[PDB]
Ligand binder design. Structure first.
Ligand SMILES: Nc1ncnc2c1ncn2[C@@H]1O[C@H](COP(=O)(O)OP(=O)(O)O)[C@@H](O)[C@H]1O
Ligand SMILES: [Mg+2]
Lengths: 371, 214, 71, 178
């Protein structure tokens, strides 16, 4: 019947039914365990909280992320999350629903082989398939030619596609995403006297970033206007009632995307990473790649990130040509939407990984078919 | 075509004659009693004074004992897995809350009878019973969902027969679709202190309404 | 037609919601009809009891759902 | 919907475009059924293989229009029209529409060629082949020499000639009834 479409990322987990238009379950990808002594009898039996319920009890838990930098590092906790979304979130039996998974490019091969093994052996699905996140962003955009800049919580990568043909030699992957911006913000905030060291307090800082941070069109000019006046100050209220104030740190945190040397990385900014990827393609398709520049992921949701990218690209590309940036309002769910289009497609119903093929080939079947 | 779909009523309305033999019906009755006790706070329900709250507390405690018995007898036959441990945890929680409700209700009744109504004239005395009741209701909702998941996971195993498992007589509706884009407002200029959005808690009426009967 | 499309599913959901919103009116009318009959029969008490229970639970659910549209 | 960008057509706002997206996508499914019947009766050859290549593309483009239009519809309700106040969200559906039409033009010509080539072939009976209801125009004669103009003198940078993309109106206008 309906085929499940699960998009598991570094920060969030998205799941739903293929053919729909929106996911049916969005919860954080964290697993927490108690760290305090239990004194009331019967209240300490629960030893692990997953998802939203773990987020509501941050005060007595130690939160951990099973996935970091797009690579699964704790396979025991990952099975906990997959069980949560199949029974407590979608309320379905996996035995009669083929599932579609996603994974970032330039990722270790052992990641998807062990992902497939769990699905067939543990949950016993009839079929499955693993796709590339950046490719699925083009399905949701109603296009077949363009360069996709996907920036999530753990990894940022670029994939150019022309007329449905990929160029693997032009794919650039940079390990710099929202989680690295959160860590930089905590260090930067200490200048004003605020300290957040607990893992539960990192969730507070993450929420501060999503509600007060923005990208400045010109960094050097904005810094001048920050010191002279106090018109860029805003206040945020902590859960216990304390009030903090943010000055120039609002635009300093997202600036490290274009100046990775703030964190100490030697790599180049995301603006000239895309330009290098375009210049590695054939000269004939560079015209259609400068236009049709698609952005996806939650990290690309800062105000003014689209306008800033266009200004930086235009200064590098030849002046004769035109540069366009595509930023849909729902770009935080673009990866999942493309997965729903692909899974429900009529012509796609012949390239699932049936359980029969897994029997005669093992986990290695995914490389020759899923790609 | 309107006439033949009245079977939905007949199938649905026929679940209320079991007289405490099914998990979902007992949980629903629990929910009604707790809603009455909660609405007593605003003085807009059947409960008019403290003694009504004491009687409601005793009734919901007896219901909690029955629910604990049913949960234990449905959890014994399930083979050991990740689902069983949660069931046992919520059963222990239910036992604790039921005992607390019983003892606190008895103490409040004695205090009212001894010192008079003026001692418990303020409504602040009844908040303890209401808090215990809502904690018990949250535990009951959690254990009902866990029991349904456990029953639907291991319904083919031996010993599961002759049991009115909720996975047989009830079906769970699929969850609603999340909003694609967060609603935009004018709150940016209305208030000048951004605050973390308060996390919405599960109302026990809603989490039980999503069970459908055949 | 070639592939499953969300519009048909949306129509199905809307029809199901309307059916659920009319079955409660039918239930209320049935309760009103059985309540106002002065005569009583043995095979009517259980029906009418289950009917008030179902209606009262439905009204409680509606009242709880209504508040969620406010702040 | 192409003229919607210039704002001189029957469509007036975004909601008009979404309604037009369903109509063209729904008509795509019937086109797939019509084309596939000819391919099944046609014996295996180069023409049949070309015919089935475009029918793969029709399914993808039609499915994209259905899902993408639904997404644009829900976003309109949640955030209001001011979210889609800019026309940028409109060209997402317009781009897929002209992508679909290019495949529709190609599969029409491929279907016609197989019909005329194998008109007498067994299996084509009791079918509405274009070979019995339509005729091709002879292609226009090519110019013998590209006439020079005086504008090239003003430009100091000689550029490559822009590729000429066929217009679907002109590609279908060459059909004539018997
Ligand atoms: N509105 C926003 N502004 C800035 N950053 C955001 C916003 N929304 C989400 N983020 C950040 O981007 C990340 C989005 O995660 P998402 O793209 O949904 O899946 P993944 O976990 O695969 O990245 C979050 O970790 C969050 O820190
Ligand atoms: Mg992602």
């Amino acid at each position: 019947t309906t085929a499940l479409v699960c998009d598991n990322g570094s920060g969030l987990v998205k799941a739903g039914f293929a053919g729909d238009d929106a996911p049916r379950a969005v919860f954080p990808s964290i697993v927490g365990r108690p760290r305090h002594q239990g004194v009331m009898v019967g209240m300490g039996q629960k030893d692990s909280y997953v998802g939203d319920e773990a987020q509501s009890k941050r005060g007595i838990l130690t939160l951990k992320y099973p996935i970091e930098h797009g690579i699964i590092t704790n396979w025991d906790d990952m099975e906990k999350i997959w069980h949560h979304t199949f029974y407590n979130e979608l309320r379905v039996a996996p035995e009669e629903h083929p599932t579609l998974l996603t994974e970032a490019p330039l990722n270790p091969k052992a990641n998807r082989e062990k992902m497939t093994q769990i699905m067939f052996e543990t949950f016993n699905v009839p079929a499955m398939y693993v796709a590339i996140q950046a490719v699925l962003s083009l399905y949701a955009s109603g296009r077949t030619t363009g360069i996709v800049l996907d920036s999530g919580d753990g990894v940022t990568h670029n994939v150019p596609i022309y007329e449905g043909y990929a160029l693997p030699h032009a794919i650039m992957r940079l390990d710099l995403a929202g989680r690295d911006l959160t860590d930089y913000l905590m260090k930067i905030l200490t200048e004003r006297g605020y300290s957040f060291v607990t893992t539960a307090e990192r969730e507070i800082v993450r929420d501060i970033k999503e509600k007060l941070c923005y990208v400045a069109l010109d960094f050097e000019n904005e810094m001048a206007t920050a010191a002279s006046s106090s018109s860029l100050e805003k206040s945020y209220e902590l859960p216990d009632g304390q009030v903090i104030t943010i000055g120039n740190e609002r635009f300093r945190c997202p600036e490290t995307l274009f100046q990775p040397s703030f964190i100490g990385m030697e790599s180049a900014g995301i603006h000239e990473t895309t330009y290098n990827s375009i210049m590695k393609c054939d000269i004939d398709i560079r015209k259609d790649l400068y236009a049709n520049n698609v952005m996806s992921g939650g990290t690309t949701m800062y105000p003014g990130i689209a306008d800033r990218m266009q200004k930086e690209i235009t200064a590098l590309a030849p002046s004769t040509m035109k540069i366009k940036i595509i930023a849909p309002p729902e770009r935080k769910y673009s990866v999942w939407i493309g997965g729903s289009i692909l899974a429900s497609l009529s012509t796609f119903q012949q390239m699932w990984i049936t359980k029969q093929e897994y029997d005669e080939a093992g986990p290695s079947i995914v490389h020759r078919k899923c790609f | 075509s309107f006439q033949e779909e009245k079977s939905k009523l007949d199938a649905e309305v026929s679940k209320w004659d079991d007289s405490g033999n099914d998990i979902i019906v007992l949980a629903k009755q629990m929910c009604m009693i707790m809603m009455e006790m909660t609405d007593f706070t605003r003085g807009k329900g059947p409960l008019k004074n403290t003694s009504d709250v004491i009687s409601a507390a005793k009734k919901i405690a007896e219901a909690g004992s029955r629910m604990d018995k049913l949960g234990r007898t449905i959890a014994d036959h399930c083979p050991d897995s990740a689902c069983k441990q949660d069931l046992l945890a919520y059963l222990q929680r239910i036992a604790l809350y039921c005992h607390q409700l019983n003892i606190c209700s008895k103490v409040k009744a004695e205090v009212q009878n001894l010192g008079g109504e003026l001692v418990v004239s303020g409504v602040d005395s009844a908040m303890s019973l209401i808090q215990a009741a809502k904690n018990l209701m949250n535990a009951v909702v959690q254990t009902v969902k866990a029991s349904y998941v456990a029953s639907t996971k291991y319904q083919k195993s031996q010993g599961m027969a002759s049991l009115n498992l909720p996975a047989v007589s009830w079906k769970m509706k699929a969850p609603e679709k999340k909003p694609l884009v967060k609603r935009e407002k004018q709150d940016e200029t209305q208030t000048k202190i951004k605050r973390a959005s308060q996390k919405k808690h599960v109302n026990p009426v809603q989490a039980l309404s999503e069970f459908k009967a055949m | 037609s070639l592939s499953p499309d969300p519009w048909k599913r949306d129509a199905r959901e809307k029809l199901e919601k309307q059916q659920q919103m009319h079955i409660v009116d039918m239930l209320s009318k049935e309760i009103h009809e059985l309540q106002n009959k002065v005569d009583r029969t043995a095979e009517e008490s259980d029906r009418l009891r289950k009917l008030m229970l179902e209606w009262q639970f439905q009204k409680r659910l509606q009242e709880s759902k209504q508040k969620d549209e406010d702040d």
